Amino acid sequence: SFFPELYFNVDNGYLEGLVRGLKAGVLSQADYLNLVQCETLEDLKLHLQSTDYGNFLANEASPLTVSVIDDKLKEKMVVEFRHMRNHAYEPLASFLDFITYSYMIDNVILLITGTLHQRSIAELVPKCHPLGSFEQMEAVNIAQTPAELYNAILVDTPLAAFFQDCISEQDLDEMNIEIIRNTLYKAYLESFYKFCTLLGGTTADAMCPILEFEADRRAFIITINSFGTELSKEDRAKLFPHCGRLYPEGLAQLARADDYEQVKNVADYYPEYKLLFEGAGSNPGDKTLEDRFFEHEVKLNKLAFLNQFHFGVFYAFVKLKEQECRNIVWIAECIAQRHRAKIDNYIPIF
Amino acid sequence: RGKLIAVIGDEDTVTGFLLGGIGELNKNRHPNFLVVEKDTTINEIEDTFRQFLNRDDIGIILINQYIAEMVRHALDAHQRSIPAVLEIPSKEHPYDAAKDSILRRAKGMF
Amino acid sequence: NQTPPTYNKTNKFTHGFQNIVDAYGIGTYREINPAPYTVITFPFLFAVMFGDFGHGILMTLF
Amino acid sequence: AAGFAIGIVGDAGVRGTAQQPRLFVGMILILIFAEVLGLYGLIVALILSTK
Amino acid sequence: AAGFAIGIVGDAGVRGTAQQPRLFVGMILILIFAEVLGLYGLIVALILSTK
Amino acid sequence: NTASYLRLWALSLAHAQLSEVLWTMVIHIGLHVRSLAGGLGLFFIFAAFATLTVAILLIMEGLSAFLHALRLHWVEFQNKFYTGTGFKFLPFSFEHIRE
Amino acid sequence: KIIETKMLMGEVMREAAFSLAEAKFTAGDFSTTVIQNVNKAQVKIRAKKDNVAGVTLPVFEHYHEGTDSYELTGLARGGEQLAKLKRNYAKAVELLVELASLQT
């Protein structure tokens, strides 16, 4: 429509140029090959210095470990994200907040559980993922009282709206922590998806396909993983988001399914997924189902940078950078453990 | 029922075992394990090791080799049978061989 | 003293007409079957809507 | 009005067909209905233009 | 109206072609219909202006 | 219901109107005072005419009239006497013969 | 047998550590949840006596108590990698139990 390409660049013009400039710095296939041809962590550092990465392990402990590279990679992209998030205006900032919500959700799961099993907040905060931040008090110095954390969340934490599904504290004590976090995430996906459709221009068309993919992916994987555990079929269905292509018809079959084959039979109705389940050879020395989903998700996030006037480039950016970290750490880990035959399990991000 | 296995090791080692189904809280909410980070000092490891020896519900203790080196005096000082201590390679440290109690006890083994 | 099924005997010709009736619903036990009259009534009302000599030929030949 | 229907039906129909080859015939029939909708306007215009 | 279609179809066509080079002929054929829509405009306009 | 049967008029009228216009604006155009050119043109024009007659009238209008006449039975006729529900009779049968 | 068992322990840890890296790749940071959320053990060890001769030696015996482990699909739902990881360590645990008994 005529919705983009007009007012977009007035406030978001700078950031759009910056974020695509940052994308230009992602490791290419040629660069990954140079990183694979190392077999030494110190040599890995040297090859990283060839790109926008590098000089970030400087002044660290003389022994170089994988755990250090992992933390540093996250830190770099967090700074770049926060920089763009801070130099931004409400029209975009609210969109970006949803991205941060995904990480905040995990972090508040950490704040509970520990609070429920008398652990101090100060002990928990150091292990929270960046971007959660939680600069607000009341969530701090809760005195290991679940009620104090529950009230702090409703009031100060932006995720308060999502907790409407899991309320009264009773839910915190009686529900399994994983059902609580899956329920909260569902609420996130439902609101975030609708938000993208309210921005019913290029962003909706470029962004929603990715969110719909995630919703359908989780429905597939949850159904499979839930087979061997103790979970009512109805409670499992309660966690299936309605923002996807399985919602019209398909989730009903996954909710009833008790076998991998039945899950695949559902995919058979959706070629975009059927190909993934067929590609997921799952051999004892092959790629698995999760790997094919990761490859698809990246394909979609790359296509996001085919539109020059939307918000989906910023969401895709974060996910592509996170996969970049997963790729780099995998290489560092393969070197540390010397599993060279498994080195080519990174997801190319162009 | 009888005995628990206590683990003193790095982040990945402890995590793996906990997923392995081994390890639990005592009635005093104490955990039969310690996660040893770069900021963890010698007194914390040594005191933890000793307390596990002072608990009648533990027994086998699993420790990373590099940790055993840090508090080695405590592992040779105590010679009993409840506290059977096994030393294992960390994710990055290499396979153990030297200074192994058994290779030392037996003069006919590599 | 249970509700019996509704059985209508059909043949190679009348079966199709019974089906377009059943498409709406299964009649009450011992209900008057509309199909014997549908066989003519429906084509007639159609022919009123589609009363076209030339196309009727094409349709017949098909 | 007919163009609107063609637009929406084509958009959904093309994607639906890719996920379901059996939809092709149904898609065409909906398109034929849209063509008939366009013709209706032509018919009235032809009656008026010579009246 | 024709130019609008040109915009929408060309933009989508390029993204599609980037993924699928076989799309080249298809999108060009569609663009031909939009050009014809513009031509129809010219035809009527010329007929009226010289009438 | 009495008004509903105006479906008979509406569909019969529409068909006649489509036929007159489809004839006049398609096949008439295939005729011309030039002998050979007329014949050769009528060849191609007729094929298009037959195509439109089938595509628009033989299929679609027959299809709409098919349903609308059936609806008249469903809504106005049957609802005067054909009431209630029953169960489909499913006896033991050797159904899988063609398979 | 103790020397052969020690050898196997090494190889098993090599596989387990790689499998952990695989679970980490998919899940991201699952270690934090596992470490904090601990309550009951699935595996416990029973004392047994080995009457090898007039002397009796203490041995450990693996006891699969049966209490269910934590069900984790929260991070990227990497349940299959976590399940293979549980199995890989479960094997490690059984070997280590046997291993400690052999030290006697």
Short mmCIF file of C-alpha atoms in Angstrom, two decimals, chain A:
data_model
loop_
_atom_site.label_atom_id
_atom_site.label_comp_id
_atom_site.label_asym_id
_atom_site.label_seq_id
_atom_site.Cartn_x
_atom_site.Cartn_y
_atom_site.Cartn_z
CA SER A 1 0.00 0.00 0.00
CA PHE A 2 1.03 3.71 0.24
CA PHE A 3 1.36 3.31 3.99
CA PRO A 4 5.17 2.92 3.94
CA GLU A 5 7.72 4.81 1.83
CA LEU A 6 6.33 8.09 3.11
CA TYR A 7 6.38 8.88 6.81
CA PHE A 8 8.64 5.94 7.72
CA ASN A 9 11.95 7.66 7.07
CA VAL A 10 11.02 10.73 9.10
CA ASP A 11 11.91 9.11 12.41
CA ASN A 12 13.06 5.62 11.40
CA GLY A 13 15.20 6.67 8.46
CA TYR A 14 18.45 6.74 10.40
CA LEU A 15 17.89 3.41 12.14
CA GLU A 16 16.89 1.66 8.94
CA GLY A 17 20.20 2.61 7.37
CA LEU A 18 22.09 1.66 10.51
CA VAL A 19 20.48 -1.73 11.02
CA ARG A 20 21.06 -2.78 7.43
CA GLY A 21 24.64 -1.58 7.75
CA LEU A 22 24.92 -3.83 10.79
CA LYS A 23 23.45 -6.73 8.83
CA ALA A 24 26.21 -6.22 6.28
CA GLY A 25 28.62 -7.27 9.01
CA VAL A 26 27.21 -10.75 9.58
CA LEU A 27 29.57 -13.63 8.90
CA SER A 28 29.37 -14.81 5.31
CA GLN A 29 29.88 -18.36 4.10
CA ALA A 30 33.40 -17.38 3.07
CA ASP A 31 34.03 -16.09 6.59
CA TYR A 32 32.68 -19.19 8.34
CA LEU A 33 35.01 -21.32 6.25
CA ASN A 34 37.95 -19.25 7.48
CA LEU A 35 36.71 -19.77 11.04
CA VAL A 36 36.31 -23.52 10.57
CA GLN A 37 39.86 -23.80 9.21
CA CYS A 38 41.34 -23.14 12.65
CA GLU A 39 41.26 -26.13 15.04
CA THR A 40 42.63 -23.75 17.66
CA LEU A 41 40.76 -21.28 19.84
CA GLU A 42 43.55 -18.72 19.61
CA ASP A 43 43.57 -19.07 15.84
CA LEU A 44 39.80 -18.64 15.91
CA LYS A 45 40.32 -15.28 17.60
CA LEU A 46 42.82 -14.27 14.92
CA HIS A 47 40.40 -15.16 12.13
CA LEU A 48 37.55 -13.32 13.83
CA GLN A 49 39.69 -10.17 13.81
CA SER A 50 39.24 -10.22 10.03
CA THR A 51 35.64 -9.07 10.41
CA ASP A 52 33.56 -6.68 12.48
CA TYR A 53 34.14 -9.21 15.21
CA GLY A 54 37.39 -9.20 17.11
CA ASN A 55 39.52 -7.44 19.71
CA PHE A 56 36.76 -8.21 22.23
CA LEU A 57 38.72 -11.04 23.83
CA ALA A 58 41.55 -8.60 24.49
CA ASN A 59 42.50 -7.97 28.12
CA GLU A 60 40.69 -11.15 29.16
CA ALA A 61 42.26 -14.13 30.92
CA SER A 62 45.26 -15.57 29.11
CA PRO A 63 43.51 -18.97 28.83
CA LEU A 64 40.73 -18.67 26.26
CA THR A 65 37.58 -20.69 26.85
CA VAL A 66 34.31 -21.22 25.05
CA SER A 67 32.24 -19.79 27.89
CA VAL A 68 34.04 -16.46 27.50
CA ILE A 69 33.46 -16.31 23.76
CA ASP A 70 29.78 -17.12 24.35
CA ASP A 71 29.25 -14.27 26.81
CA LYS A 72 31.18 -11.80 24.68
CA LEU A 73 29.22 -12.53 21.52
CA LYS A 74 25.92 -11.88 23.27
CA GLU A 75 27.30 -8.73 24.84
CA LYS A 76 28.29 -7.28 21.48
CA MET A 77 24.85 -7.66 19.90
CA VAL A 78 23.09 -6.56 23.08
CA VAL A 79 24.96 -3.26 22.96
CA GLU A 80 24.11 -2.81 19.29
CA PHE A 81 20.46 -3.63 19.95
CA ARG A 82 20.20 -1.41 23.02
CA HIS A 83 21.84 1.40 21.06
CA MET A 84 19.17 1.17 18.38
CA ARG A 85 16.48 0.62 21.00
CA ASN A 86 17.52 3.69 22.95
CA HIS A 87 17.78 5.98 19.91
CA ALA A 88 14.19 5.22 18.92
CA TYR A 89 10.70 6.69 19.09
CA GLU A 90 7.47 5.16 20.33
CA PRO A 91 6.27 4.10 16.84
CA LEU A 92 9.18 1.66 16.72
CA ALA A 93 10.07 1.36 20.40
CA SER A 94 6.85 -0.49 21.19
CA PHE A 95 7.66 -2.99 18.45
CA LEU A 96 11.16 -3.45 19.83
CA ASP A 97 9.78 -3.90 23.33
CA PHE A 98 7.99 -7.04 22.13
CA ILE A 99 11.36 -8.43 21.08
CA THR A 100 12.73 -7.71 24.53
CA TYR A 101 9.60 -9.25 26.06
CA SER A 102 10.65 -12.68 24.81
CA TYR A 103 13.78 -12.40 26.94
CA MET A 104 12.03 -10.73 29.88
CA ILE A 105 9.60 -13.65 30.00
CA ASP A 106 12.42 -16.10 30.54
CA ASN A 107 13.95 -13.80 33.15
CA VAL A 108 10.80 -13.49 35.24
CA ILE A 109 10.48 -17.28 35.16
CA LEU A 110 13.92 -17.22 36.81
CA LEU A 111 12.76 -14.61 39.36
CA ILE A 112 9.93 -16.99 40.35
CA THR A 113 10.98 -20.60 41.10
CA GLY A 114 13.85 -19.05 43.02
CA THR A 115 11.46 -16.85 44.97
CA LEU A 116 9.17 -19.91 45.38
CA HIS A 117 12.16 -21.92 46.70
CA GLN A 118 13.44 -19.08 48.98
CA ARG A 119 16.25 -17.68 46.86
CA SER A 120 17.27 -14.02 47.04
CA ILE A 121 16.71 -11.74 44.06
CA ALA A 122 20.30 -10.52 44.19
CA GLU A 123 21.40 -14.11 43.59
CA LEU A 124 19.06 -14.51 40.62
CA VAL A 125 19.59 -11.23 38.77
CA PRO A 126 23.19 -11.99 37.69
CA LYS A 127 21.91 -14.92 35.66
CA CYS A 128 19.18 -12.99 33.86
CA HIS A 129 19.49 -12.51 30.13
CA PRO A 130 20.36 -8.98 29.04
CA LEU A 131 17.57 -6.72 27.82
CA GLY A 132 15.42 -7.89 30.70
CA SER A 133 17.15 -5.14 32.65
CA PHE A 134 14.36 -4.62 35.23
CA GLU A 135 15.75 -1.31 36.48
CA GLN A 136 12.57 -0.91 38.54
CA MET A 137 12.46 -1.81 42.21
CA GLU A 138 9.68 -3.67 44.04
CA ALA A 139 10.76 -6.67 41.96
CA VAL A 140 13.94 -6.12 43.96
CA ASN A 141 14.04 -6.65 47.72
CA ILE A 142 10.87 -8.74 47.55
CA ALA A 143 12.09 -10.45 50.76
CA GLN A 144 11.67 -13.82 49.00
CA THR A 145 7.92 -13.25 49.23
CA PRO A 146 6.03 -14.55 46.17
CA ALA A 147 3.25 -12.05 46.83
CA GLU A 148 5.71 -9.16 46.67
CA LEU A 149 7.14 -10.36 43.37
CA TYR A 150 3.62 -11.01 42.05
CA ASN A 151 2.55 -7.41 42.83
CA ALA A 152 5.79 -5.96 41.51
CA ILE A 153 5.20 -7.76 38.22
CA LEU A 154 1.62 -6.58 37.88
CA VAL A 155 2.64 -2.98 38.56
CA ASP A 156 6.13 -2.21 37.20
CA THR A 157 6.91 -5.04 34.81
CA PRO A 158 5.67 -4.45 31.24
CA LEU A 159 4.64 -8.11 31.05
CA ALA A 160 1.85 -7.55 33.58
CA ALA A 161 -0.83 -7.76 30.88
CA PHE A 162 0.35 -11.23 29.87
CA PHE A 163 0.14 -12.56 33.45
CA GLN A 164 -3.69 -12.14 33.29
CA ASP A 165 -3.77 -15.86 32.30
CA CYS A 166 -1.68 -16.93 35.34
CA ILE A 167 -2.95 -15.03 38.37
CA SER A 168 -3.79 -14.98 42.07
CA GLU A 169 -0.46 -16.57 42.98
CA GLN A 170 -2.38 -19.85 43.33
CA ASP A 171 -1.41 -20.40 39.71
CA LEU A 172 2.24 -19.83 40.56
CA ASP A 173 2.31 -22.54 43.21
CA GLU A 174 0.00 -25.12 41.63
CA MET A 175 1.01 -24.84 37.94
CA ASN A 176 4.26 -26.48 36.70
CA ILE A 177 6.79 -23.67 36.05
CA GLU A 178 7.06 -24.81 32.41
CA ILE A 179 3.27 -24.62 31.85
CA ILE A 180 3.36 -21.14 33.41
CA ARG A 181 6.14 -19.97 31.05
CA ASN A 182 4.56 -21.61 28.02
CA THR A 183 1.22 -19.97 28.89
CA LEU A 184 2.82 -16.56 29.35
CA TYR A 185 4.69 -16.87 26.06
CA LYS A 186 1.46 -17.75 24.28
CA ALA A 187 -0.03 -14.52 25.59
CA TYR A 188 3.05 -12.71 24.27
CA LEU A 189 2.71 -14.23 20.82
CA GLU A 190 -0.98 -13.44 20.62
CA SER A 191 -0.56 -9.79 21.58
CA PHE A 192 2.60 -9.28 19.53
CA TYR A 193 1.06 -10.83 16.44
CA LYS A 194 -2.02 -8.63 16.71
CA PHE A 195 0.23 -5.62 17.24
CA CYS A 196 1.97 -6.39 13.96
CA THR A 197 -1.39 -6.66 12.20
CA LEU A 198 -2.45 -3.31 13.64
CA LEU A 199 0.58 -1.93 11.82
CA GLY A 200 -1.15 -3.23 8.74
CA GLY A 201 1.39 -2.28 6.11
CA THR A 202 4.66 -3.70 4.87
CA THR A 203 5.56 -4.73 8.40
CA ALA A 204 2.50 -6.94 8.73
CA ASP A 205 3.26 -8.75 5.48
CA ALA A 206 7.00 -9.03 6.15
CA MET A 207 6.72 -9.76 9.88
CA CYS A 208 3.64 -11.95 10.41
CA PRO A 209 4.91 -14.90 8.32
CA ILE A 210 7.77 -15.28 10.78
CA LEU A 211 5.54 -15.10 13.83
CA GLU A 212 3.11 -17.53 12.24
CA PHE A 213 6.01 -19.88 11.57
CA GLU A 214 7.13 -19.79 15.20
CA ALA A 215 3.59 -20.50 16.38
CA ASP A 216 3.26 -23.50 14.10
CA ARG A 217 6.77 -24.71 14.87
CA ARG A 218 6.09 -24.70 18.58
CA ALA A 219 2.80 -26.52 18.07
CA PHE A 220 4.62 -29.24 16.13
CA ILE A 221 7.54 -29.69 18.50
CA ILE A 222 5.48 -29.45 21.68
CA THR A 223 3.17 -32.17 20.43
CA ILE A 224 6.11 -34.48 19.74
CA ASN A 225 8.02 -33.80 22.95
CA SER A 226 4.84 -34.05 25.02
CA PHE A 227 4.32 -37.67 23.96
CA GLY A 228 6.56 -39.21 26.59
CA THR A 229 5.60 -37.01 29.49
CA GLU A 230 2.68 -36.49 31.84
CA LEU A 231 0.42 -33.92 30.21
CA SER A 232 -3.30 -33.84 29.50
CA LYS A 233 -4.13 -33.47 25.82
CA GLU A 234 -6.40 -30.55 26.69
CA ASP A 235 -3.69 -28.78 28.68
CA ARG A 236 -1.32 -29.29 25.77
CA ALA A 237 -3.82 -27.72 23.39
CA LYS A 238 -4.15 -24.79 25.80
CA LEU A 239 -0.55 -23.91 24.90
CA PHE A 240 -1.04 -23.91 21.13
CA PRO A 241 -1.04 -20.33 19.81
CA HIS A 242 -3.85 -19.29 17.50
CA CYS A 243 -1.60 -17.09 15.32
CA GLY A 244 -0.51 -19.48 12.59
CA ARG A 245 -1.69 -21.69 9.78
CA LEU A 246 -2.61 -24.66 11.97
CA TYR A 247 -5.28 -22.71 13.83
CA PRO A 248 -8.13 -22.99 11.30
CA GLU A 249 -7.68 -26.74 11.24
CA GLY A 250 -4.64 -28.71 12.23
CA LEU A 251 -4.10 -27.99 15.90
CA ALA A 252 -7.09 -30.19 16.67
CA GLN A 253 -5.24 -33.11 15.09
CA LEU A 254 -1.99 -32.38 16.93
CA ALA A 255 -3.91 -32.09 20.19
CA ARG A 256 -5.32 -35.59 19.67
CA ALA A 257 -2.13 -37.07 18.23
CA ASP A 258 -0.21 -39.54 20.35
CA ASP A 259 2.56 -40.37 17.86
CA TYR A 260 5.23 -38.82 15.68
CA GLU A 261 3.57 -40.26 12.59
CA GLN A 262 0.31 -38.48 13.35
CA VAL A 263 2.18 -35.20 13.73
CA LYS A 264 3.80 -35.71 10.33
CA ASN A 265 0.39 -36.54 8.85
CA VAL A 266 -0.65 -33.03 9.85
CA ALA A 267 2.43 -31.56 8.20
CA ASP A 268 1.51 -33.44 5.03
CA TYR A 269 -1.29 -30.94 4.58
CA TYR A 270 1.19 -28.04 4.62
CA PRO A 271 3.98 -28.40 2.03
CA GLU A 272 5.97 -25.61 3.68
CA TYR A 273 6.26 -27.90 6.70
CA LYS A 274 6.09 -31.30 4.98
CA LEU A 275 9.43 -30.56 3.34
CA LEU A 276 10.98 -29.84 6.73
CA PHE A 277 9.85 -33.14 8.25
CA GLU A 278 11.08 -35.00 5.18
CA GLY A 279 14.38 -33.11 5.25
CA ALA A 280 14.78 -33.91 8.95
CA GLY A 281 16.22 -37.32 8.14
CA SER A 282 16.92 -37.80 11.87
CA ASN A 283 19.59 -40.43 11.14
CA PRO A 284 22.30 -41.41 13.64
CA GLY A 285 24.65 -38.89 12.06
CA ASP A 286 22.38 -36.47 10.20
CA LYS A 287 20.39 -33.28 10.80
CA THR A 288 17.30 -33.40 12.99
CA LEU A 289 13.91 -31.75 13.08
CA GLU A 290 14.98 -28.76 15.15
CA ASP A 291 17.83 -28.12 12.72
CA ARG A 292 15.51 -27.85 9.74
CA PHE A 293 13.28 -25.39 11.58
CA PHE A 294 16.29 -23.23 12.35
CA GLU A 295 17.26 -23.22 8.68
CA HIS A 296 13.75 -22.18 7.70
CA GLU A 297 13.55 -19.43 10.32
CA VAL A 298 16.77 -17.92 9.05
CA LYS A 299 15.55 -18.04 5.45
CA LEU A 300 12.55 -16.00 6.53
CA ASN A 301 14.63 -13.51 8.53
CA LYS A 302 16.88 -12.99 5.51
CA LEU A 303 13.86 -12.23 3.32
CA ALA A 304 12.91 -9.56 5.84
CA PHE A 305 15.72 -7.42 4.46
CA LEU A 306 13.97 -7.35 1.08
CA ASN A 307 11.64 -4.63 2.37
CA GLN A 308 13.17 -1.23 3.04
CA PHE A 309 10.25 0.39 4.92
CA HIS A 310 9.07 -1.78 7.81
CA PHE A 311 9.83 -2.91 11.35
CA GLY A 312 10.47 -6.56 10.47
CA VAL A 313 14.09 -5.80 9.61
CA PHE A 314 14.77 -5.08 13.28
CA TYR A 315 13.17 -8.30 14.50
CA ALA A 316 14.95 -10.32 11.84
CA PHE A 317 18.21 -8.60 12.75
CA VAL A 318 18.08 -9.80 16.34
CA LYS A 319 17.27 -13.38 15.39
CA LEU A 320 19.98 -13.52 12.73
CA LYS A 321 22.55 -12.20 15.17
CA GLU A 322 21.47 -14.71 17.80
CA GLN A 323 21.92 -17.52 15.29
CA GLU A 324 25.28 -16.02 14.36
CA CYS A 325 26.29 -16.41 18.00
CA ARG A 326 24.99 -19.98 18.04
CA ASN A 327 27.07 -20.68 14.94
CA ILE A 328 30.25 -19.13 16.33
CA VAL A 329 29.94 -20.80 19.71
CA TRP A 330 29.36 -24.15 18.01
CA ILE A 331 32.65 -23.70 16.17
CA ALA A 332 34.46 -22.72 19.36
CA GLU A 333 32.94 -25.69 21.16
CA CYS A 334 33.85 -28.11 18.37
CA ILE A 335 37.43 -26.88 18.55
CA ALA A 336 37.61 -27.16 22.32
CA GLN A 337 36.34 -30.75 22.19
CA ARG A 338 38.03 -31.45 18.82
CA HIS A 339 34.93 -32.78 17.00
CA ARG A 340 35.99 -31.62 13.55
CA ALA A 341 33.61 -33.98 11.68
CA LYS A 342 30.65 -32.17 13.25
CA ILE A 343 31.87 -28.64 12.48
CA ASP A 344 29.53 -28.18 9.53
CA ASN A 345 26.41 -27.91 11.68
CA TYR A 346 26.20 -24.13 11.61
CA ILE A 347 23.23 -22.40 10.01
CA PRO A 348 24.39 -20.13 7.16
CA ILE A 349 23.08 -16.61 7.61
CA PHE A 350 24.42 -15.22 4.32
#
